[PDB]
Design a protein around this ligand. Structure first.
Ligand SMILES: NC(=O)C1=CN([C@@H]2O[C@H](COP(=O)(O)OP(=O)(O)OC[C@H]3O[C@@H](n4cnc5c(N)ncnc54)[C@H](OP(=O)(O)O)[C@@H]3O)[C@@H](O)[C@H]2O)C=CC1
Ligand SMILES: NC(=O)C1=CN([C@@H]2O[C@H](COP(=O)(O)OP(=O)(O)OC[C@H]3O[C@@H](n4cnc5c(N)ncnc54)[C@H](OP(=O)(O)O)[C@@H]3O)[C@@H](O)[C@H]2O)C=CC1
Ligand SMILES: [Cl-]
Ligand SMILES: [Cl-]
Lengths: 316, 316
């Protein structure tokens, strides 16, 4: 049976733990192990990859299916020699549920004025603030795919008003959606903007000052919030900073950045209404990843269509 | 028609705003207005009260129904001269939904290691941490009433394992519940303990070091968390502090305190894994409060039973 190459820049202890009993009957070649640094990888059919080294595909020229370790494929699409074979992205209940946790947390942190209450606590000052309920806030989600839909449904269940935007219009109970041409109408209703878009050439720099200026000022805080857990390349950080400084944006939650890891010299670390997380909104459960890859391999070898195959021209 | 006395120690601008068009056809006597400081209040049937002055019931001896401005009645039950007539507590979708927001926020803040990521951000340090999903954590809620049930259902929908405890066993889909005698079994399964109990003589000092020592150490963080938004008198703050210092408790979210407002000299303000909020977990929407009171008055005057009447002997 073909081995499976594992080249995942994840927390090493998590990958190592998941290797036990993974891919039964196949050799598993974990490229984090120095013992494998010279192994020729010709004749091997499958690789599971995340932030892999530039030479990987020259070493493994006979791959039949490439599996991303994440939902996003904007990096793997750039790897030199990426083979002309199906590229399968990671889609799984574990990833989806994790993203929705992070999105819900940000919407609650902003709704419930967490930074204000923390500033009061720093002064040892007890002060109750006037407080809207979730239903007083419209959360607008750009990207109505696997992650956007789950987050929308969960936010609505917690009481937020929720609307969605994507290229085509999606039909979702309890969530009004807009297609591409509806962007401006969607923005004008949105108090908390949530980004769950892939990075593609068409989404590069989409979150910019002109867009933030179209967000609603009619909500309970009088100024919108920007929350991004898609990709950093979709935002213009110079504009985010300008808009936070001026008050065009009242706050932000950023999990993703134009250049990661985020520079230690970035202003974002110290800003009073910005929450920074280090690209952890939805971690890949490595056990679940390997179960997913196993399942797709079994489909492939039985002559069934692969699931979650990306359109390389579209970039997602 | 009888006037309605309003004596609510809430944010004044909120009460004032809600007075417009409230109680149509009745004089509304807002005791926050100095113009009313000498008004005799005999012959008046209804009062809506929160943190009211010790002399209120000597001024208003002819009340037929007393309405609490909150869900909790432990303070109003202590007011001198509280009349021997029905005491109606506040129960409303707005209050419930607000509590569930706060409970969800705390469970997510603790699950998602928010304080760790904030400490990293303070150092301008990008570091991903190993991260459990919600389903890896058991949230145990003490108090399975209006607030406890709603919070349990919402937490379960976001992926947490949820169990509940109260005096009698409650039947709730997707949430295993325990009765009084099941407390120890319940505690031993609980990673995040959430308090949503009233203060009564039987719940005074219930959250103490012996109880925290029975919480699970088998969860993903190896140490339990304590979250209280019931009443401060149910907890022993000396024990909370001892247990945080020793690591018996890994963290806490406290909305309520033994003596409020919380002393500026309290250690809780500066502790690295304690979130302090100033008794704001579920604010009373004053408009909704007045609609509720109006509805109960109409029932009363039509000969229908009042709803949400407290048992003064039980204290809730
Ligand atoms: N921060 C983190 O830890 C993580 C980040 N992510 C990011 O989240 C992204 C979304 O994942 P997922 O929901 O699974 O992806 P999906 O492919 O399921 O959804 C993508 C959505 O974006 C929309 N879209 C794409 N391009 C455009 C465009 N030009 N204009 C308008 N809408 C557009 C799609 O529209 P349509 O339906 O019309 O095609 C679709 O609704 C990933 O690509 C990845 O970058 C994912 C996991 C973790
Ligand atoms: N922090 C904040 O902003 C707010 C705090 N609160 C607090 O939340 C409390 C709960 O409100 P709500 O859910 O509406 O009240 P409910 O009366 O609906 O529920 C109370 C629950 O506590 C249980 N209980 C009471 N005494 C005991 C006991 N000795 N042992 C075990 N279980 C007990 C009851 O059990 P049983 O069902 O068997 O009677 C019931 O499940 C309020 O009393 C108030 O103090 C409320 C609003 C806002
Ligand atoms: Cl800011
Ligand atoms: Cl602490």
């Amino acid at each position: 049976k073909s081995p499976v190459i594992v080249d995942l820049k994840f927390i090493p202890e998590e990958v190592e733990a998941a290797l036990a009993g993974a891919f039964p009957g196949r050799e598993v070649i974990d490229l984090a192990d120095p013992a494998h640094q010279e192994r020729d990888l010709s004749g091997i059919d499958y690789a599971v990859v995340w932030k892999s080294a530039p030479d990987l595909f020259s070493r493994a020229p006979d791959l039949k299916v490439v599996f991303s370790g994440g939902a996003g494929v904007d990096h793997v699409l750039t790897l030199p020699g990426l083979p002309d074979v199906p590229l399968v992205r990671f889609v799984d209940r574990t990833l989806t549920t994790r993203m929705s946790e992070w999105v819900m947390m940000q919407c609650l942190l902003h709704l419930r004025q967490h930074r204000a209450y923390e500033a009061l606590a720093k002064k040892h000052e007890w002060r109750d603030l006037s407080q809207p309920e979730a239903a007083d806030v419209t959360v607008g989600i750009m990207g109505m795919g696997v992650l956007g839909q789950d987050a929308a449904r969960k936010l609505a269940a917690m009481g937020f008003k929720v609307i969605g935007w994507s290229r085509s219009k999606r039909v979702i109970e309890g969530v009004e959606t807009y297609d591409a041409a509806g962007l401006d109408a969607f923005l004008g209703r949105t108090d908390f903007l949530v980004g769950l878009l892939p990075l593609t050439p068409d989404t590069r720099g989409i979150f910019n000052a002109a867009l933030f200026a179209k967000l609603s000022r009619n909500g309970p805080f009088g100024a919108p919030v920007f929350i991004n857990a898609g990709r950093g390349g979709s935002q213009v950080e110079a504009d985010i900073l300008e808009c936070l400084d001026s008050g065009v944006l009242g706050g932000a939650s950023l999990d993703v950045f134009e250049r990661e890891p985020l520079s230690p010299e970035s202003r974002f670390w110290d800003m009073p209404n910005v929450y920074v997380t280090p690209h952890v909104a939805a971690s890949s459960d490595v056990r679940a990843l390997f179960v997913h890859v196993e399942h797709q391999i079994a489909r492939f070898e039985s002559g069934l269509p692969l699931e979650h195959v990306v359109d390389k021209v579209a970039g997602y």
